[PDB]
Structures are given as structure tokens and as C-alpha cells.
Symmetry: C3
Subunit: 340 residues, 3 copies
């Protein structure tokens, strides 16, 4: 909701309130998602200022508040800052922001991250270039300095974050992305590589001096139709954690595909089908394991622009003999989301 | 504060800044509350959208920020998401919302939860149906026909918390009220399955109910509520270091408050809750209240334990808003 | 940003989004400030209502850190800065809650650097910074006679750690180029007295013709906390001698170059005796774009000895802050 425009500074304060619930077989411990309450609410601001006819300043922020938690010591469980950065867009030169932003490989992963509740499984938080990552400088360029229409590229730095845990750690990195949209159709191809922290390399699973992610995507966005498809492979990046022995680490090689097909009613109902598959290779002692693999049947009915409900049943494809203990039961979400 | 209204969507962003200090004998170890700083702040949003003339959508949220905490490692303590739900009201059919909302037994218990700071002692958080409870589906003047009487039905899904205090299972709850002639009646009850963790506590189904009768007119507030819980109320022991729920409790809440247009609102209240047939000690909070809250405008305002020295060790001895 | 005026009530909801990063040789083991990401965000409200003709506030401010991951460390740095009053005619103000310390009034004249500076202003350290639950009576323009004064009550705060604990105390400040002086003393906590290693400054400033010349001196008495890397033991400097010098000229162009020198030295601390806490030379060039978006560089020449008692480090910030 735009709540202030004066002396030429726009400030949008937005928020959600998703009443959410997962259903699986008796506390879905062996399922895709889980079981019970998932109610959460977000609260961020978008702020743009106009210094010149060409130069604008922005700063975005976004915090996650969890409603499933009690008022005990776990009241903060899941509370986190999703977005926090500030930047300058200048004429046709391009934009530049630093802070906690998306990774270049999310530009490519964005094409398919569109299911009502689930999807975008490959887009891990604090996993280098596929999602929210702390302290990252990002230069983006739209329409190649205004010359070519549709061709966009971006270039990302991503500085070192020596975390206490190896799960969220990262070192000096480099990332790129390229897109081309031509009347409905869309192609994209991102790639990024970074040094792995010594704590990450001292993990049981996964070996290699540096981490690497890339993915390429196609989409059709016209006539109230979305057909999204992307594929990507990580090498020494994806967290995997064996459920049996409770020993975590990174997958030496992954092969990930996302297919999304949804149609949009002007009536409001948006049915969605989706198939995802992320398969690990060269697992330190197991070999080829399926991280995630399923079919999706989703129907979101937007009431107005400020209110909706949705259902996301996920056909869990993972066989019971999963040599990593990853869930094999089915999950279905039921949500009523208000926003502003 | 209503901060946005456009294209059929009202959005209210509200907040408080209570500067509060507690006073008891010395450090108030065995007191009602505590002693020292108690400063805190609320900040939440309310948000209704008009889908139709009949169908309106809503969403609320509220989070607590404590001020008495230092800026160090303890800064997050007390910070909690109070309210968070999203629902639909439809013509005279009624409302339905899911998320962290108010329990049906609070509808009847809320008749007396109107003291300045204290009061509503039986309204325990994450305690089945008597307070702020996580993830709960809630349906709330009889199809528009009979005005002045409202009913509600609540579901409450299972919540497998680490601690026994906050856990629960599948349940059912009802509430029915009737208000007229500046007065109101209400009666709510609920029952639920307990987790095996809950069943395995020293001190497997929980029951809680209460009724309330009140009168508000001529700036006079006369509230009374009474009810009993069964295998619900947590209490634990300080001496024995043993936690658990009370087999049965006997709870009464008596409030009388008069609002003087001058601003001073004197409030006299008496509360009493006695646990029954507790496994170890048998039958064992109760006090009389003195309160004067001074309403300035629509924003600014400012504002006797009867428990013998007890086999349990129960204690003895300015708000801006927008 | 004022987001609501109706029925004579102003509700200003403000916020920032600072993209910060510290630079040091390889890692920040033996540096002043640190190294890596420092991105954070502020978000509070300033709420004033007029009750009558003469008598009229409620303020709050929370910290959200951005260098944290969405793992377990997400609330690392998250905290409330402010939460609390009335001003009546010429009587003056009075508020209770988590607010500033009276010794900050003198320290505030020099707490004016891009990112660093104001080292004497520790959080929850007697009266030199942000402290919880304090009644503060402040009077404006001396009842309209001339001069400004304030009195803080500072309630007891029985904290688990010795560093963040506090008891009852009293502090005063008076201000009127510009000069100011503040003093405060309080009963030390049980754990304050039971620690191996309290009373506490006056200020001068000149803010006119696009120049800011700031100078203040202060001495601590068993309140400034410190620990040493060698013996890993917490405590309090029995006495410190603190100086802050700030000299900056603000161009109409927008660029604001700043040079600053700070020095705080502890005295007869039970264990190390007289040691120098912090000492450096600062060169900063903050560039205000407009009244919202701005950036800054903050190079700091660390004047702490290598062979240093307590082993304090022997840095340069780069920020791009949007605000509202
Ligand atoms: Zn995002
Ligand atoms: Zn409530
Ligand atoms: Zn402050």
C-alpha cells in the first residue's frame, strides 16, 4: 500500500497475513512439507526517491513474523529479515544495491517459482546464488543501456559470510544473469561461482575448493497463460543432510528441472500443474539420490487484489527406499491470505 | 490509525508505547508480578477488503516488542506474535478465519478481562480455549433474524510444541451470547485431546468453560464471570519443581468500573481461582483490585493479594497510542 | 514520514535501509570495527497528540539486522532502541521507558560521525546511552525565562549478566557556539560490585555557516565495562579519561568531509591498572544525495598499539542508506 508521496519520495508499506495449514499422515515427519499450523505474516517497506530525472534512490526491507509459534521461548522461531538493501538506478547505465538480496541464479529460478505454496525447491536460502543471501552487491542493466529491447543482464559479487554453521556459510563469489523477453515468451540463463569456507569443506558430504550454480529458463506469459520450464545443475552447493545418521553437507552434483503450467481466469481461479525433480550425483558414499521429486496440482482463487484462498496438493514421487530418508508422504496446503 | 482506504480496502496501522515500572517489596521475588522496568510496545495492522456488498475479507496481525530488555543477548525475550488471522465475512451468514486468534472460552471470559493492566488471570496463553492460541479455525445475530444474540463454533488443530505448557490436540468449542438493555449474557465451553507428552506430566482430555453477565451504560461497567477448567490450567510448584495441569479449577471474576467524563475511571475488581483434586496436595490465585485509569483523549491515558504465605509458593506482596 | 494527521494527532512512521560493509586486512581479528557485511534496517514511530492547550508523545524504534542468515542467527542484533511522555506549557517534559541517558546529552554533541564515533556512548552502560525504564523530567528554555535542563530517575534493572545490570540512580544535565554539562551516579548492582575489575561529562559545539566544530571531555568512575582477550575476564574500568574531537564542513554540493580524533584511557582498573581503551584518527566523506538517499566512506587510522594491554585491535565503512 502506497502510504506516503511528498517532496518526491514514494514509500510503500506492504504486508500479508496467510492463515496456512499443512496436511500429511499423522504429523507428516516422512512427508514433503509437514503437518499442522504454518500461519505467518510479513511486513516490509519499498521506498523510492527521485534525485534527478535519471537517478532514483531505493531501499527495500521485509521481515517474516510466524503465527504458528506459541508465546514461549519459541515465539521467535522462523522470524527473519527476508530483504534488506538500498540502491541507485541511473538513466540507462543500470541499478546497484548492496545488502540481503536475491542471487543471480534466482533470476533463472524465478521463471518457475510460481506454485500457490510450494515449488522453487532449488532456491535455497543462504545457498550462494539461488535465493536470499546476506551482504551482496548486485549491478542490474535493463534493455542493454536502453539500446536493445528485451535483452537484460545482471552481475553479482556476493561477499564472504563466515557463519557459525556451514549450512549458511559462503565466501567471495561472482554471478551473472541474462534474459530476453519478446512479446510473451521469455528466456533466461544465470550462473555463479564462489570459494567455499573452510568450515564447509570440513563437512562429511561434498568435496571441492569452490561452489558453483547455474540454471536456464523458458516461459510464456500472455493470454492469461503461464508455461514455465527451467533446468540447472549445482556442484558442491546444495545442502542435503542424511535423515538416518543426521549428518549434513553439500551434494557433489545435482540435476534439477522445474515444469509449471497454470492458466489464469479473469473469474479469479488459477489452476496449476507442476513437476519438479532435483537428483543428487556423487553423494559422499550413497551416489545418486533424489533430493526432491513430485507432481503438483494447485488451485488459487484470488477474490480481489487484496484477498485470496488456495490449495496446493503435492503428489510426492519419492520412493520409500530413499537412501537419504527424505519424505515420501504427500502434503496439501490450505491457505487464506489477506494482504495490503 | 486508518492509513489507507482505496479501491474498497481499509488498512489500519496501530501501535502503543507503554512506559511502565512495577513496584513490590525490594526485588519482589514472591510477589504477584515483579519489580523494575516493564516498558513495552505493540505494533499491528487491521485490514478489511470489500469483495461485495455481502462478502468482505479481513486480515489482522499484532506483535509485541518489550522495552525492559537490554540491547544485549536478552533483547528478544517477551517479543511474540500476538494475533495473526485472515477470514471472510459473508452477508448475514457469518465470519470464518484461521490463524492465531481468540478462543471461544475467551468470549465469555473477556466479559471481565477489562482491568487497566492486571485481571483476566484465568485467560492463559496457549491454554486450549481461554487465550491467544496458535492455528485455529473460527466461525462466528443468528442469520440476521434474531438481533442481540451471537454464537460461534471453533475447531483448534493439534500443535505438538516442545514444552507441555503450549501443546494441544484436536478439539471442539462453542460460544453463545445475548446482549440488550445495556447488559449481556454469554456461555462458552470447549474440550480437546491432549498430546502423549501432556498425558505424561506429573501434576488425556482437557475441558474449559465460563459464563459472564455484564452491564455498560451511564458510564458504568459491572462485570461478573465464573467457570471451571478440567485437566487444562498449568500451575506447577516452586518447592517441589514439578509442572502439570490442574484436574479441576473454580474461577470467579468480579469487576465494577465507572468512567467519569472528567477522565479518572475508578475500577474495583475481585478475582478468585482455586484448583481442585490436584495430584499430590488436593485443593489450593485470589485478590481484590484497586484501579484508577485517567482517559485523556482517544490516544493518551495513564493508570490486594489474598494468598497466605500456601503449599505452592504463590506470590503475595503512561500509555501513548495511535 | 508523517503518515496520519486527523483529530489533531501526528503519527510519524520512519525507517532506514543501510547497506553497510566493513573492510580490514583479510579478516577483522585485530581491527577497530570488524569486517564483512553490516547491512541493517530501522523501523519506529514518533506519535504526538495535543490533549489540551499547553499539555500534549509516544516513541518506539526497533533494529532488524540484515547480515544475519535465515538460520538460527536471524535475531542476532535485533533489538528495541526506544520505547516510552508529556510536555505542559513552560513546565517542561516528563517520560518513562527505554530512552537516552543524561550523559548522552554531553556525548551527543560529538556522536556525529558517518558510521563510527561516540565510543564513550555504550548501550546499557549507566547513563552514556540507551537505557531501559527511566523517568526523565526535562524543561525547555528554562520555563521560557532564558538554558535547558533535565533529570532522570533510572529504575532498578536486575539483569542476569553483570554488563547489562543497573540499580536506582540520579542524573542531571544543563545546556545553553553551544555548551553543555551532565552528571550521574547510581548504586552498583550486586554483580557490578562482585566483578573482578558508579559516577560519570561536558560538551562544546559550533553549528553555523555550514561548519560543525565539536569537543567534549568526560571521566568515568567504575562504569565503563571492558574485558581482555588474554585472561578472558569481564570487569569495569575504575576510572577512564575520554576526549572526542569532531571537525566537519558541509558543502551545499552535498559532500560532507569529516575528520575526528577520539581517545578513552582507563585508570587503576583492578588487574591492568592504567590502559588506553580506544584511540584513532578518522577521515570520512559522507555524500547526502537528497534528504533521504545518501552514501558514505569512513576510513579510520587505528592509533591502538600492537603490544597492547587487553589486546584491543590494531577498518573502513562503506554505506548506502535509503531512509524515510
Ligand atoms: Zn524475496
Ligand atoms: Zn488479544
Ligand atoms: Zn537513540
Amino acid at each position: 500500500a502506497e502510504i506516503y508521496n511528498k517532496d518526491g519520495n514514494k514509500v510503500d508499506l506492504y504486508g500479508k497475513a496467510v492463515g496456512l495449514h499443512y496436511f500429511s499422515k499423522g504429523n507428516g515427519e516422512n512427508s514433503y512439507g509437514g503437518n499442522g499450523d504454518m500461519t505467518y505474516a510479513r511486513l516490509g517497506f519499498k521506498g523510492e526517491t527521485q534525485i534527478n530525472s535519471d537517478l532514483t534512490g531505493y531501499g527495500q526491507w521485509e521481515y517474516n513474523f510466524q503465527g504458528n509459534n506459541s508465546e514461549g521461548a519459541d515465539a521467535q522461531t522462523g522470524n527473519k529479515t527476508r530483504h534488506a538493501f538500498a540502491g541507485l538506478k541511473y538513466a540507462d547505465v543500470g541499478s546497484f544495491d548492496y545488502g540481503r538480496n536475491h542471487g543471480v541464479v534466482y533470476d533463472a529460478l524465478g521463471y518457475t517459482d510460481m506454485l500457490p505454496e510450494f515449488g522453487g525447491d532449488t532456491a535455497y536460502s543462504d545457498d550462494f546464488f539461488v535465493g536470499h543471501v546476506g551482504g551482496v552487491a548486485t549491478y542490474r542493466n535493463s534493455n542493454f543501456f536502453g539500446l536493445v529491447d528485451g535483452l537484460n543482464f545482471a552481475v553479482q559479487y556476493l561477499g564472504k559470510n563466515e557463519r557459525d554453521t556451514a549450512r549458511r556459510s559462503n565466501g567471495d563469489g561472482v554471478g551473472g544473469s541474462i534474459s530476453y523477453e519478446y512479446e510473451g515468451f521469455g528466456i533466461v540463463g544465470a550462473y555463479g561461482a564462489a570459494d567455499r569456507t573452510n568450515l564447509q569443506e570440513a563437512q562429511p558430504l561434498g568435496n571441492g575448493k569452490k561452489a558453483e550454480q547455474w540454471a536456464t529458463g523458458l516461459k510464456y506469459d500472455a493470454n492469461n497463460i503461464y508455461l514455465a520450464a527451467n533446468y540447472g545443475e549445482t556442484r558442491n552447493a546444495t545442502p542435503i543432510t542424511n535423515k538416518f545418521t543426521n549428518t549434513s553437507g553439500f551434494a557433489n552434483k545435482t540435476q534439477d528441472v522445474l515444469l509449471v503450467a497454470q492458466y489464469q481466469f479473469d473469474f479469479g481461479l488459477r489452476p496449476s500443474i507442476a513437476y519438479t525433480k532435483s537428483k543428487a550425483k556423487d553423494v559422499e558414499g550413497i551416489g545418486d539420490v533424489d533430493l526432491v521429486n513430485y507432481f503438483e496440482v494447485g488451485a488459487t482463487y484470488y477474490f480481489n487484489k487484496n484477498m485470496s484462498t488456495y490449495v496446493d496438493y503435492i503428489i510426492n514421487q519419492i520412493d520409500s527406499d530413499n537412501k537419504l530418508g527424505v519424505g515420501s508422504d504427500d502434503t496439501v496446503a490450505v491457505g487464506i491470505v489477506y494482504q495490503f
